[model samples]
Target: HWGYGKHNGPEHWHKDFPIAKGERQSPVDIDTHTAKYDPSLKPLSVSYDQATSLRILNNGHSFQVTFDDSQDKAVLKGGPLDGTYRLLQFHFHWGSLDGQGSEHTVDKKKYAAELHLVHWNTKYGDVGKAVQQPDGLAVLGIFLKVGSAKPGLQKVVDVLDSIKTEGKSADFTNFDPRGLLPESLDYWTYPGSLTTPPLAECVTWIVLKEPISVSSEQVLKFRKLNFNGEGEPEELMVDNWRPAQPLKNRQIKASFK
Candidate 1:
């Protein structure tokens, strides 16, 4: 299995997932001065149900909170998207230590961590297949910083103990993703790809301009997770983030000037 280690890191992913080397890659340095302000871009409309969040799983890559998308209860509209994109899952990318862990950076400035809320277009039958088509996926990237303990964030960190080991999962419900977002929906939109395997260029990335606060202790809880199974020598899962990729002439459009 591929992971964020020296042996199978982002640099080597191209050997297996060819799209890893594609032009439209993610986590690029956001240059606001260079970004275009689109007058026609609509404000992002997000709706998430408290009951839609089903459970949390440790996929050995990262701890992912899956959502029940049997209906359009949790969906994203407006903001660089034409149709509704349903929320499927959410996860985090953090560094092993302080001052380093976010995937997308603003003006080349890094944050303590980054959170991804993954969604797929409703036009597609499944997110897996939808990821291979153009305009099929939408990801919300929120930056995290070290500050006071975020009350909303505490709920998620509390469950890490149960899901610390690989392949472990616990039922998680009543978590509305909106709580994780910043007060302002100001964002920069760009055409990019999934940071992981099969790194398809199907994602319409909406990276929030503002960052949320998380306590230092809360961020460390995520680092305590292991990439290996129970038996194997526990390889701590830290720095589970892909490095920033090339911009390659892609336009970054902002919803608000």
Candidate 2:
């Protein structure tokens, strides 16, 4: 029941998931001036193939596009990562409005939405096992602003009708996630946890400095999704985002000046 609502939202998450109050929580505000530029950080390497994408589903929290992690067909390396991380799944967090939705803000400026590309270290076996290790997960965060229509995103939005409710699934293939990213790869890296429970503190967050665009109308399609399963009372899935957590003296490193 952990969701972005008054009762089960972030404030109440600590009741069940004590780690929600842990030292290295995620979705922290990124202050540009304080972020130290690390010259040692290498350029991020991402190789995603369309065949790696498997399906799209609504997991009661947010819709996810899952990838086939049976092998390293799609992988992420470089940046702050010490080893290759296999792509597992990707999802988005958005709000009801365009002004405030993104989890990681830039100088307290929120984007319309945020996209998370989740990957797990191959050395840890799988995501299940990897999530427990401090350096086993790497999430690439891309901020989304409301403006021009993104054809790449539109492809996903077009199929939302088939999976309108929670627990729905549909085949989603031939979609390369690379098209969804911004042209600039400059980013800020930090040690953090999952924004959602059990709030595992295993992620090395790489939040991009540049943001992609999405049409205002296309976001409304995301809201058309129901958080509740069929035959239950339908609740619109909007504002599925976590607020910025305390930085806790953690350093945020940048790949650029």
Candidate 3:
């Protein structure tokens, strides 16, 4: 029931989930001019097996593509991370309108949307257990802008119709997540929590500097997916992201100057 609606919105989250008030929360604003540029940050390295994806699910929140990460089939390495973080799933967050949906902002600039590819450290036994450890998870954030259509995105959007309601899923395979990334690997690194509750502070965030493009028409399809399961009052899925969190003493590291 904790959704983006006015009743269960981010402002009221602390009432139910106390961790929402915790020091290390996500959805932070990156003032690039002030962000510390580190000389030692590594270039992003990702190896995604074209066949590791399993299915796409509509989880009453956002439509996500789940992966088979039981083996070393797909993974993300380097770039502000200490070791290999195996792929878990990839999902998106968008607003009801363009230029104001993305969770993280850069110098007060808001993108049309954001894409998150979740991963867990290989050292952990499983994602559930790893989420408890401080270094358990790593996420790659790619911003989305409304512009010329990216044929790369058509593959995922094309399947949205099959899973237009919560809990619906279909077999999806041979989809390489690598195709979703922008050309530039440059990014801003920081320490943060999952944007959702449990609100665990187990994430190492790597947000890309360059954003990819998606046509305006495709963006509206995301809003059409219903958060309500069959038989429940149909609730449109939009604005499913947390507001920007306070940056107390956290320092951001940049992978490029």
Candidate 4:
């Protein structure tokens, strides 16, 4: 049912999926003036290790990897937040062709792409159950900009040759996704929901102000991923991003000097 192509675009996701209406979306142009910055907000720490179960899935939209907490040291505290959550999954949202693709917005400007590091409260047992809780999930948002040289996305690009055929995926072994995190963990957090359908309003959003760089060539390769079947001709599957949503009555807090 989920294939990368014209009909499957996220814009049209609500057409077939009735639950999309309630989905908590992302990439909204952030109006810093309107945001309620809290100087006390703090950054969470995440430590990756071998016990974490990492599995790559071909979800028709893009390549997503699901992970489980295999170790501790991943803690969240202070700055109006207090708890211990486990890293669950990290996924990417990009454009179909190139030049544009991202799930979050800053000051009304959209970047080339965005990455989400999903985490869930340990009290919930797992991410699925956590998703049902109001504060069950915490997502770290990172922006991606395209450059001429490779932006160190080869860890993901190198495997493209194997899964590039659309709806095809292989096991990614011994990969530490932490490499993708921005240098500064400083972030702006808010109460929000998933950017896609079944948008659950159970997220504590931590959006990094700093963006990471990726080579134009690497972006081109990502734009090449198709959702077509093994036999079907590869269709360019870029632009897998969602537009930003209204902040409503929400408040955004920041952790920076």
lDDT of 2 by residue, 219-246 (tens): 9898888888999998998888999999
Estimate, for each residue in 109-227, the C-alpha lDDT of model 4 and write its tens digit.
77888888777788888778988888888887888887644334577777775776546767775667766767887777888887765567788888888888888787777777776
lDDT accuracy of residue 130 in candidate 2: 92
Comparison by lDDT, 1 against 2, better one: 2
Residue pairs with backbone overlap in model 3: none
Q: What TM-score, over all chains together, does every model reach?
A: 0.97, 0.98, 0.97, 0.85
What is the alpha-carbon RMSD of candidate 2 to the true structure? 0.9
What's the C-alpha lDDT at position 150 in model 1? 78
What's model 2's lDDT at 255? Answer: 100
Q: Name the 10 consecutive residues with the lowest summed lDDT in model 2.
A: 45-54
Winning candidate number (TM-score):
2
In order, the Cα lDDT scores of the candidates are 0.89, 0.92, 0.89, 0.70
Clashes of 1: 0
Q: Model 2 — TM-score against the truth? A: 0.98
- lDDT of model 1 at residue 213? 92
**Global lDDT for candidate 2?**
0.92
What lDDT score is found at residue 244 in candidate 3? 88
Estimate the TM-score for candidate 3: 0.97
Which stretches of candidate 3 lie above 4 Å from their native place? none
If both were scored by lDDT, which would come out higher, candidate 3 or candidate 4? Answer: 3
* Top candidate when judged by lDDT against the true structure: 2
